[PDB]
Amino acid sequence: GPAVGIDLGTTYSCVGVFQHGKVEIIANDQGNRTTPSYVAFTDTERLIGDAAKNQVAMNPTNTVFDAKRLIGRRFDDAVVQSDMKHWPFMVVNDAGRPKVQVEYKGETKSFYPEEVSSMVLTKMKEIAEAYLGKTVTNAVVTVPAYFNDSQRQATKDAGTIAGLNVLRIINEPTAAAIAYGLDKKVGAERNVLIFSLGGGTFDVSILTIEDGIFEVKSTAGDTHLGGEDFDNRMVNHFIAEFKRKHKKDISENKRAVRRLRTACERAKRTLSSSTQASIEIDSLYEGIDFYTSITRARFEELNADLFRGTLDPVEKALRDAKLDKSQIHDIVLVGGSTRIPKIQKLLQDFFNGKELNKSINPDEAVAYGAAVQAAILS
Ligand SMILES: Nc1ncnc2c1ncn2[C@@H]1O[C@H](COP(=O)(O)OP(=O)(O)OP(=O)(O)O)[C@@H](O)[C@H]1O
């Protein structure tokens, strides 16, 4: 069986396989090329992926996500302490190790973050197996450049418990560079900038590649800035509109809010291609249908400060790496959020018109690169 490349993201995961000199990004059961890093526990079953996210508003306390934020950390970890204040599921301390506590089939059960991720990993494996028509064992899993040894360890373990023989754990920016072939020897040193803006995190990495060896010269970004923050701005915008039209504040109703958020996220994707999208939600609050729409222009102004602030970490990365704008040779977009036109304009304007590498779907670039690497490693 071929070795596969797996991008284990904070919000979405993606799997690809190298076959006949071409990389195949494998779609799932619902035909999506990336699947939510969601796991859900109910009275009768364990849901994973799309099925899990498709019922989150109906089972918030038993639907787990953001496991990538817990993986490899200690319960006492300041990050953990700050984050758990926002999760609808329980996080308990087990001799210093954080554990997620959920109710499965009427019984109370807890899981280590690596066990949850192994679940998402299992779903990717079977997605690949369903496509390949053969058993998948060897794999290359990616991890952010800033992950320490514990985090890499935990990610490796999540893979082994998923029945995957992890050939190697490589950095996400490095995988991205490999996808574009920027690892090829050209008898010269090349500076590559990876701009990764996913569903929940923002990373900027400057890699220096010479003789085929990568050297992460600098990194920056924000661990709490991603596509979900954009959705939230839309949500707050529509809560206000609903109130204008029906003098009904739907903020208290968690279900209404979550249904609207899903509508927004979807409208947002449409906005990357069209100039306006419509929000059609039957019986949002009480029995009031919420039919409306947004234009790309309004979407941009709702998120203006957020989009603009994206350049702050870019400047920082440059100064730390001791390089000027003119010194970076290539720029590659990674993450679903980079499909946003305004973000592409902003970055390009910042680099005085330089062309951005974006021919490969940004949310597939990391998996794409890992698949190539997996192939060579086997
Ligand atoms: N066409 C699009 N336009 C805008 N955003 C999009 C588009 N397609 C997907 N996205 C967004 O990209 C995000 C998911 O990104 P991606 O698949 O790169 O995540 P990820 O690797 O899990 O990232 P992170 O680990 O930072 O969350 C979601 O916020 C989704 O709404």
Swiss-Prot record:
Keywords: Acetylation, ATP-binding, Autophagy, Cell membrane, Chaperone, Cytoplasm, Hydrolase, Isopeptide bond, Lysosome, Membrane, Methylation, mRNA processing, mRNA splicing, Nucleotide-binding, Nucleus, Phosphoprotein, Repressor, Spliceosome, Stress response, Transcription, Transcription regulation, Ubl conjugation. The keyword Chaperone applies. It is a peripheral membrane protein. Its EC number is 3.6.4.10. ADP binds at residues 11-12, 199, 265, 268, 272, 336. Component of the chaperone-assisted selective autophagy (CASA) complex consisting of BAG3, HSPA8/HSC70, HSPB8 and STUB1/CHIP. Identified in a IGF2BP1-dependent mRNP granule complex containing untranslated mRNAs. Interacts with PACRG. Interacts with HSPH1/HSP105. Interacts with IRAK1BP1 and BAG1. Interacts with DNAJC7. Interacts with DNAJB12 (via J domain). Interacts with DNAJB14 (via J domain). Interacts (via C-terminus) with the E3 ligase STUB1 forming a 210 kDa complex of one STUB1 and two HSPA8 molecules. This is Heat shock cognate 71 kDa protein. It comes from Bos taurus. The gene is HSPA8.
